[PDB]
Design a protein around this ligand. Structure first.
Ligand SMILES: *[C@](O)(C(=O)NCc1ccccc1)[C@H](C[C@@H]1CCNC1=O)NC(=O)[C@H](CC(C)C)NC(=O)OCc1ccccc1
Ligand SMILES: [Cl-]
Ligand SMILES: [Cl-]
Lengths: 300, 298
């Protein structure tokens, strides 16, 4: 059937460390001879509301930072700031460093999160970047510096590092260049925009239904992308982009259903409703399975 | 902030290997100097409808089994069969072998699945052992020999090895002693499970979760006795709750200040009146694959 499934976490487990300033410990990512972690490890409680990160970092030295892999200290030999991350140079290249890249994902894309506490991995789950640049994650005190990732063959694409929980319970963080997703800032003040449904992934869900023989919702009509997007917005669905259309290409080819023809099917569902009928066993449309997920779980 | 979470899979990934016999390739589990895998790797399509496994295995040699750890061949130096599993002895010990044990899990309990293809880990997800001894997994051709596990500290407790997809799309397999969960058999036939039931203890745990994450519209001012709850539960194909189960829910009851039987009263109401279209923790339906431990652990 269809499960939310994460990528195997071993290659990322091999990169997790803890970074401590004073009594403040969060997680870091050790790749070759660099450790990446959220810059607010250098904050005290009283700096959190409006920290002056440049001045806080001037007061630090290499020997202010305790970096550990397990209980083994990793000596810090340089430190600098890159946007909202610290880059700590260490004197040991991580022998478990996988093939990796740093990627900045788009809203709607999914990734696996390895939730870690004190450098120790606790659990792994899949989540989607919401259109408002938050994730609906599962993060407790001590989770900061946990990362999100995807795996392509042997290569780990790191896409997320965790920094904060917003008042509504959703989560915000950065890419591995330290740039936040969305408008958020790493100070202890912030509201996410109203969220919307990830149209790309609903379309993927419809394609998945068709692949599995559930196709009552197809119709004989089509739409333009503009007409679809104008309707979608009235129902709090995200507008489709050209990238979304391209990403649906494989599923469209697999089923023979043009992307804009599936858009016409979805438009009719939005305007008329499900009327009690179901799709893949549910009255509600799923929006956190990507086209990649559908193809992986339908075809392998 | 509450998701289905799997255990980190690294300690298990380091044990996964590919096993080939004849034209059949599936996964095995390499612990110390032993590789475990489904015995139907020795079957030919014809054998499959009524395989006399002892007779088919005595006709194999050590050299019939090709075991590969990545790019490296492991030489098989012996083999035995234990229920529905083969135990292949190899000439190399796995240095990545974690501390581990073999456990037979009980219906209602959860575990993580590491789905593997050609000895290569592909995905990880959480599963419950259903009351009818199936699991609702995500398994394709090539997934046989994938394993399910839990982690306690740094000890991996292996509880599942994958063998079968039933016509209904659910899945069936064995423990790591090779004994099937459920009435299933490793012959190539269409098999049906007994009727399934809902795991009441897990639904209650998940309702306590919803109350910890702020959601509590389904609560009510009423209570019930344990037996009256079980009468209604059984009518709706829910498992009855034992006093042991009530005891297990204590900490969640303490944390939230909601007595277990008060939560039972809320569930009874949900069973009899439905959700009115509302949702709990985002779900339109009552989730039953979170245990009390799973909820507390997160
Ligand atoms: C499992 O044997 C496997 O993955 N084998 C490797 C392999 C390689 C290439 C092609 C096929 C298989 C397999 C796992 C199944 C397949 C699809 N999803 C799964 O989870 N298990 C089986 O094929 C069972 C083997 C028996 C001997 C245990 N057979 C099975 O599931 O049959 C179900 C069935 C349904 C209707 C009618 C007859 C049989
Ligand atoms: Cl049969
Ligand atoms: Cl009733």
């Amino acid at each position: 059937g269809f499960r939310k499934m994460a990528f195997p976490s071993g290659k990322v487990e091999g990169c997790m460390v803890q970074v401590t300033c004073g009594t403040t410990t969060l997680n870091g990512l050790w790749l070759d001879d660099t450790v990446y972690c959220p810059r607010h490890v250098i904050c005290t409680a009283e700096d959190m509301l409006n920290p002056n990160y440049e001045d806080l970092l001037i007061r630090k030295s290499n020997h202010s930072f305790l970096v550990q892999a397990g209980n083994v200290q990793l000596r810090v030999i340089g430190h600098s700031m890159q946007n909202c991350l610290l880059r700590l140079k260490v004197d040991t290249s991580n022998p478990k460093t996988p093939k990796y890249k740093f990627v900045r994902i788009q809203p709607g894309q999914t990734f696996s999160v390895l939730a870690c506490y004190n450098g120790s991995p606790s659990g792994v789950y899949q989540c989607a970047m919401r259109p408002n640049h938050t994730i609906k994650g599962s993060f407790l005190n001590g989770s900061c510096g946990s990362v999100g990732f995807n795996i392509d063959y042997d290569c780990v694409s790191f896409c997320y590092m965790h920094h904060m929980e917003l008042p509504t319970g959703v989560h915000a963080g950065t890419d591995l260049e330290g740039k936040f997703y969305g408008p958020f800032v790493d100070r202890q003040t912030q509201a996410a925009g109203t969220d919307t449904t990830i149209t790309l992934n609903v379309l993927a869900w419809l394609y998945a239904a068709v692949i599995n023989g559930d196709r009552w919702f197809l119709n004989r009509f089509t739409t333009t992308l503009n007409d679809f997007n104008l309707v979608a917005m009235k129902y709090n669905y995200e507008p489709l982009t050209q990238d979304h259309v391209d990403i649906l290409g494989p599923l469209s080819a697999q089923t023979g259903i043009a992307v804009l023809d599936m858009c016409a099917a979805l438009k009719e569902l939005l305007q008329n409703g499900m009327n009690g009928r179901t799709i893949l066993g549910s009255t509600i449309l799923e929006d956190e399975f990507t086209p990649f997920d559908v193809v992986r779980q339908c075809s392998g």
